[PDB]
Scaffold this active site. Structure first.
Site, PDB file in Angstrom:
ATOM      1  N   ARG A  30      -2.983 -21.507 -63.361  1.00  0.00           N
ATOM      2  CA  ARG A  30      -4.048 -21.494 -62.408  1.00  0.00           C
ATOM      3  C   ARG A  30      -4.254 -20.176 -61.740  1.00  0.00           C
ATOM      4  O   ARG A  30      -3.364 -19.395 -61.600  1.00  0.00           O
ATOM      5  CB  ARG A  30      -3.858 -22.557 -61.362  1.00  0.00           C
ATOM      6  CG  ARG A  30      -4.294 -23.908 -61.830  1.00  0.00           C
ATOM      7  CD  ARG A  30      -4.346 -24.910 -60.742  1.00  0.00           C
ATOM      8  NE  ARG A  30      -4.789 -26.141 -61.328  1.00  0.00           N
ATOM      9  CZ  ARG A  30      -6.044 -26.395 -61.680  1.00  0.00           C
ATOM     10  NH1 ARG A  30      -6.984 -25.494 -61.440  1.00  0.00           N
ATOM     11  NH2 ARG A  30      -6.350 -27.557 -62.244  1.00  0.00           N
ATOM     12  N   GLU A  60     -12.371 -23.204 -60.801  1.00  0.00           N
ATOM     13  CA  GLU A  60     -11.934 -22.082 -60.021  1.00  0.00           C
ATOM     14  C   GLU A  60     -12.827 -20.885 -60.186  1.00  0.00           C
ATOM     15  O   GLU A  60     -12.616 -19.878 -59.576  1.00  0.00           O
ATOM     16  CB  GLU A  60     -10.505 -21.723 -60.397  1.00  0.00           C
ATOM     17  CG  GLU A  60      -9.473 -22.722 -59.890  1.00  0.00           C
ATOM     18  CD  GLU A  60      -8.051 -22.436 -60.315  1.00  0.00           C
ATOM     19  OE1 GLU A  60      -7.783 -21.438 -60.960  1.00  0.00           O
ATOM     20  OE2 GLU A  60      -7.177 -23.215 -59.985  1.00  0.00           O
ATOM     21  N   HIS A  80     -11.191 -21.009 -69.725  1.00  0.00           N
ATOM     22  CA  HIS A  80     -10.353 -22.168 -69.933  1.00  0.00           C
ATOM     23  C   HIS A  80     -10.339 -22.595 -71.395  1.00  0.00           C
ATOM     24  O   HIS A  80     -10.640 -23.688 -71.714  1.00  0.00           O
ATOM     25  CB  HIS A  80     -10.773 -23.313 -69.025  1.00  0.00           C
ATOM     26  CG  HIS A  80      -9.669 -24.257 -68.702  1.00  0.00           C
ATOM     27  ND1 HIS A  80      -9.882 -25.489 -68.155  1.00  0.00           N
ATOM     28  CD2 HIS A  80      -8.343 -24.156 -68.879  1.00  0.00           C
ATOM     29  CE1 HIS A  80      -8.735 -26.102 -67.996  1.00  0.00           C
ATOM     30  NE2 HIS A  80      -7.784 -25.306 -68.417  1.00  0.00           N
TER      31      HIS A  80
END
Ligand SMILES: NC(=O)C1=CN([C@@H]2O[C@H](COP(=O)(O)OP(=O)(O)OC[C@H]3O[C@@H](n4cnc5c(N)ncnc54)[C@H](O)[C@@H]3O)[C@@H](O)[C@H]2O)C=CC1
Ligand SMILES: NC(=O)C1=CN([C@@H]2O[C@H](COP(=O)(O)OP(=O)(O)OC[C@H]3O[C@@H](n4cnc5c(N)ncnc54)[C@H](O)[C@@H]3O)[C@@H](O)[C@H]2O)C=CC1
Lengths: 335, 330, 330, 335
Positions: free
Chosen positions: D234, D263, D295
């Site tokens: 993350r 995010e 991602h």
């Protein structure tokens, strides 16, 4: 009035919102396509605003009616996605934008022409990485060359005015020649003459049965080697399989195409084997002086404002019971 | 006469060769820069042909004379790279191309304006990969906007004709009026008025002591937010730090710069004692609507032919003992 | 010794300068090719250092002798550019670098493999524009696939260790077994089997008369659909036209090639003719999962430092008059 | 069972369709986000399958319940988008994918490292246009260097296996050291040691209060100049503003970040501004040895098949009334 907008892009939203300060409609924005399944999202709205990829076929229209919608507004000139016969039966009213700003479209055509000519798209690709090589970037001087414009409606004429500014010799073809063009010093000619003598050819005409595949192999054969071809009109005007060959044989020096959304899926090579375009868009762009833009020709602030103004005004007329001059009907010659 | 061509690019070779069909010089092409070290390569040539990056300073000329060169032909308008006084002291003769095709340069400026305006450079990077998204690509309609052209010489006038075809209102700043500009309906104005009123600003003037940093911090402050600035003229006309800042502030909408090879080590921001940076070119191009081309404005077949024709003609005139109007001194 | 370096890239200079500290030599960097014409630039130098594109032919060698040069140092393995016996006759000495760092080449082959697998080169073109779409980027998990390595010499063994770390089944073809490959648990097979079973194929062998076009049309027919092929070895190990066909019909999933400079000019599609081009590099990169690198496999700081050390040392052996193992004759 | 899939991408559709051969569900695929507005499109479906950007807040859940939906399946590990407290209150059962294929993720991290190391992404941009210049493309040999891995769960361990194969010296940090790593030859070390000695650092850990901004200005100072940093974990693991400064100062040699969709909006510019943009993605990519992927770490066929298998199997277990080990509850620690 509550309005649901489908297929919303950020520019659509901004201009519609900006324009709405004058109308005070309630605006609901949806990113997604209108379809038979998404139609239920319109419940509580009087109208819908749609674009080229939205589904206006009968089953969608039936759903919209069940959900209380009365008005369908196209924020575009094209309307072939909407079943006008069904719309009449349902008592649904359909309105459009008549035409895009002629200056905005002609300027885009010119932008494409120059970008291609000076290889500016390639240059940026280098320079963004601080590569300043000029090899393969050489263009041609526009002044003193011949430009051929196909179609002398308002867009063509707006193109012709810019082209004159470049100090080009101006030719045109239109089945019905215009006074405005004639006044500009344009020479109307037959197509074959236009094909033969033009350094740059720009298409500004609607697609009609007379002109489907207007630029075919025989047309490419007639042209000068290295000719520049620009198409901000519809795709079918060009036989794309012919165009590709012309590129390989280097008859066509440069090609720019503004690809309508409704047209991209064809606009292909094309084979019944494996794999096809989108790979074709990638290959041409890489192997040749080829530029595609994504139906960008009307994409300026002023044009978008006009589209928004017309769309909101059309809707206002409909709610007020005023006759809207942008109403569509089943017998319209371009349906 | 044998001619050694330095800094040769593929285009230089092609056009020089084609044009020389009418002249018959013996052409020897060199890829590398002319320097004090490379000048010996010219031994056996009466003449050399050079471009903006090539080194024409006194130490180079000294070597050239040593090696039997009599003539220096710049296949360019600029001569800042050649020390004319040393050349005269040494009995060398220097000739140049007086001006580029005015049309080619002006058309380039217009091409830059249009690519920037419609984000055509951004569009291509998307569509070459079959990404058809339009978001962030919004331009402006040229028609009915105000163009400000700085300098009404042949190039500026060539730009003004095109800008008229677009249907733009026309402003200009020049110390001298041009009849051709007037005929276009150009309104001459003071520079501040041009800065204040111009949607698009284009530079078409020579660099002088009077106009160094002509576009400075104060000039940017005067301008309209979102203004488009085009420079196919010399770099030092614009104070680069102030332009960068103007970009960051969003005073400048769009900037197009045709970057002189000799000027690349400028446009700096910068930092003290770090690198030489082209990183700025990368940064600006990413961050903003900015376009750099590498001294590309004369880069058409027709302009290249002209340059070549002029260069060979200049040389032929020297060889014949004629006075060449393009000589840099008697 | 003063050494003049031809064809200098920034990296050659940086590392050469670094290694020079232990040596104290005086260099002399030239960006240009050594040729018959530029050899004279070497005057004042005992030695020159050249790379693959430099001209080592007899006339160049004579000119070099005339100008006082005794020693020619290659900063590469290959020497086909240089006329060997001609040099001998001139009493010219020529030293090479035996091979590049094996780990550097293998790591590059693996890098190519992963970039292709995950379409990382494509993702970057999107993400630099803040386009985060994933469609079309799908790769395959390496772990549990079959890796086929052609050639178990030093580079191949280095590739195998990495491939082993990925958890791949390991096959190889070499006419000679390597104890170190066996230790990794590599299983040697006939070529046809390697072709049949391999998800990923990497070439790590020299070109021999007996392996020219090893990867041919019949070889491609044997392969799994979607196969990934890497070649950090010489181009002629692969029949380029067959490879193109196999790409078109989707037998080859991914192709990675490190393209030798001296080989670039072939790579036959190959049309004849109008006029010779690497439109093919462009068409392949666009239409398929194809990656080209420019003879990049040895390009790491550690590898360059090595090339630099061997080259300078190679020079010291000469100056001391001691023998060079890397000398190409006595 | 009828399943509605939201936010559908083409790979999602392909793998779910393939996997479903064994399940026989009725699948309906929607491209758009699940919202309070679009929840009504799920009428007639027992279940929905959603992903990270889909809205699972209470108003949406209330609407789904009204439309007859029983089950909610996340085809992802993350679940902060779903209001679990509300789901319980409404009798909605929520299931997820527990973790992504560890091999797929570790392999992505290594792929990033190598592309960045050899500058392969830059090479391609040149070579696709036949530019073979190598200036600026210089890398480093991995063999003999030191790798620091932060987090020794399955991914980190899978990463360590690959790294071992490179002939790297391996270090890790985990608050709870693993047997599997120790057996690999990994030296567990404190963080400052890992920062000081590592040529390459890769993050494979979950986000916790303890490690928020684990990589900060002090972390960066401790590091070797030219360090490569890879984050497939993350975003919040890194203080991005600090990472930007270290890049400017050339503390960091290379940075690779897999950007979680949820995010994206963060990763601070800053000045917060207009407010907030990804011109920073554009700049970083251009000015530095920086690489973003969206991602993409679990994006392999094998990993996607797993996600799909798990998702359908979780759903069948729910319909059959079997206890699904993937069920989420509000007291879940994460959260
Ligand atoms: N990208 C490129 O390679 C090129 C750059 N240029 C630059 O653009 C300039 C214009 O070219 P031409 O029209 O051929 O020149 P020209 O010498 O025919 O006329 C120059 C004009 O600019 C004017 N001028 C001088 N100082 C000025 C100031 N402070 N403000 C406004 N105007 C001023 C002169 O009075 C004259 O009307 C050149 O002098 C040259 O330095 C020209 C050609 C190519
Ligand atoms: N892109 C690049 O920068 C570089 C590429 N290379 C290439 O890779 C090659 C191998 O490198 P090393 O491992 O150092 O060489 P090496 O001599 O240590 O090993 C060569 C191996 O390949 C084997 N071989 C010979 N013919 C064969 C065939 N038909 N099939 C399978 N194997 C065969 C040999 O028996 C030997 O085991 C070099 O000869 C060179 O062509 C080498 C250096 C750099």
């Amino acid at each position: 009035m509550k309005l649901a907008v489908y297929s919303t892009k950020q520019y659509d939203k901004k201009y519609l919102q900006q324009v709405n300060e004058a109308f005070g409609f309630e605006l609901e924005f949806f990113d997604f396509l209108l379809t038979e399944k998404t139609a239920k999202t319109a419940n509580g709205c009087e109208a819908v605003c749609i674009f080229v990829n939205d589904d206006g076929s009968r089953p969608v229209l039936e759903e919209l009616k069940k959900h209380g919608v009365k008005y369908i507004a196209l924020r575009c000139a094209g309307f072939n996605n909407v079943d006008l016969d069904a719309a009449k039966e349902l008592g649904l009213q359909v309105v459009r934008v008549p035409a895009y700003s002629p200056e905005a479209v002609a300027e885009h055509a010119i932008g494409m022409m120059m970008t291609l000519n000076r290889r500016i798209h390639r240059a940026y690709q280098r320079t963004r990485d601080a590569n300043f090589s000029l090899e393969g970037l050489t263009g041609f001087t526009m002044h003193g060359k011949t430009a051929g414009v196909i179609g002398t409606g308002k867009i063509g004429v707006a193109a012709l005015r810019i082209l004159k500014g470049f100090g080009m010799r101006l030719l045109a073809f239109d089945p019905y020649p215009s006074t405005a063009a004639l006044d500009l010093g344009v020479e109307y000619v037959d197509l074959q003459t236009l094909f033969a003598e033009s350094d740059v050819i720009s298409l500004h005409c609607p697609l009609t049965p007379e002109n489907y595949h207007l630029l075919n192999h025989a047309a490419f054969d007639q042209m000068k080697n290295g000719v520049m071809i620009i198409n901000t009109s519809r795709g079918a005007l060009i036989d794309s399989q012919a165009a590709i060959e012309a590129l390989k044989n280097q008859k066509i020096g440069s090609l720019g195409m503004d690809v309508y959304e409704n047209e991209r899926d064809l606009f292909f090579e094309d084979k019944s084997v494996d794999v096809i375009q989108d790979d074709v868009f990638r290959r041409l762009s890489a192997c040749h002086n080829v530029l595609f833009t994504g139906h960008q020709a009307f994409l300026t602030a002023e044009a978008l404002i006009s589209i928004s103004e017309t769309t909101l005004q059309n809707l206002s007329q409909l709610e007020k019971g005023e006759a809207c001059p942008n109403a569509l009907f089943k017998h319209h010659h371009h349906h």
